[PDB]
Amino acid sequence: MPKKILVLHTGGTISMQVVTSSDNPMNHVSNPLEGIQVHALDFFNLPSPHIKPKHMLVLYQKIKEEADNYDGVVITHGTDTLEETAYFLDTMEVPHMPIVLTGAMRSSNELGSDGVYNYLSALRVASDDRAADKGVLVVMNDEIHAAKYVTKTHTTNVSTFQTPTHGPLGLIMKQEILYFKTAEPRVRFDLDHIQGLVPIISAYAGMTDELIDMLDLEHLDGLIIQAFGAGNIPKETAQKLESLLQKGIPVALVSRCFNGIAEPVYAYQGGGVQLQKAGVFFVKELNAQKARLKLLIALNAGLTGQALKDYMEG
């Protein structure tokens, strides 16, 4: 019997330096590969820089609604923010089935002779039952990545994605899909609404308190700081963060380093030990845009107090 895959296209076509990108008709046919039957929807028509958490929730709801009608799900998504939507879905209580995101190819080739290789690869992975227990997956360029760790690294004609340090969860071979490990199950929430302001700022040599002093603390629900190294910031910045922390505003830091792991060790002012004592959350191995969603989801799910700290730092 064929595998039945639900395909949710979110990216439409876009204006590029000026022409409109081409939509390969293979993205919409019901039988793109032997043994794979597709139900493809033009679900959104959004450049990925325009994707918001409200769209991510609607994708989640669609997957829950259709879970019993398909073998797996493929979402095509502009590559600029694909990793953010992937991480979001991987933090939701998604059904136990293959769920794969892949890039919306932005092409001016009108005949489609550049192909839909990554989409076809995603259908293969979504049709393999070994993917059901691997979490939400990102498939690009014959590699299968865990949503929690994948990031876009190259801005070439077709984007490149990587998992820092650990490499891909799996590889697409000629006649097999090879998986290297099963990642640890994640803490997940059945969220139905997202609201709140949680921005991202980056530390730098010479930072003091001038930017933080500009924040309107009555409207700020949280803050992500991309800190130096294992999690350090300048002395004046750390002193100013007290006005946020003592107002009850959660502040979470990530390492600005590509392979960085956040670890409070230094005890001078602005050192990670002093920041953690003051109440800053150390997010151990996650980039800033995903830590921002982790905090936003945690606040909207109902975590407060010790449980919010323990979840963010877990």
Task: Describe what you observe in this structure.
With 314 residues, this protein is α/β, with parallel strands linked by helices. It has two domains: 3-179, Rossmann fold (3-Layer(aba) Sandwich), CATH 3.40.50.1170; 200-312, Rossmann fold (3-Layer(aba) Sandwich). It is built from eight helices and 16 strands. It has helices spanning 53-66, 82-91, 117-126, 210-214, 235-245, 272-278, 288-301, 305-312, and strands spanning 3-9, 15-16, 19-20, 36-42, 72-77, 99-103, 137-140, 143-146, 151-154, 160-162, 170-172, 177-179, 200-202, 223-227, 251-255, 281-282. The strands form four sheets. The protein has an eight-stranded mixed β-sheet with strand order 4-1-5-6-7-8-11-12, sandwiched between helices. A hairpin with a 4-residue loop joins strand 11 (170-172) and strand 12. Helix 2 (82-91) packs parallel to helix 7. The radius of gyration is 21 Å and the shape is elongated. The N and C termini lie far apart (42 Å).
At a glance:
With 314 residues, this protein is of the alpha/beta class.
What would the keywords be for this entry?
monomer; 314 residues; alpha/beta; Rossmann fold; 2 domains; eight-stranded mixed beta sheet; four-stranded parallel beta sheet; 8 helices; 25% helix; hydrolase; Structural Genomics; Center for Structural Biology of Infectious Diseases; csbid; monomeric
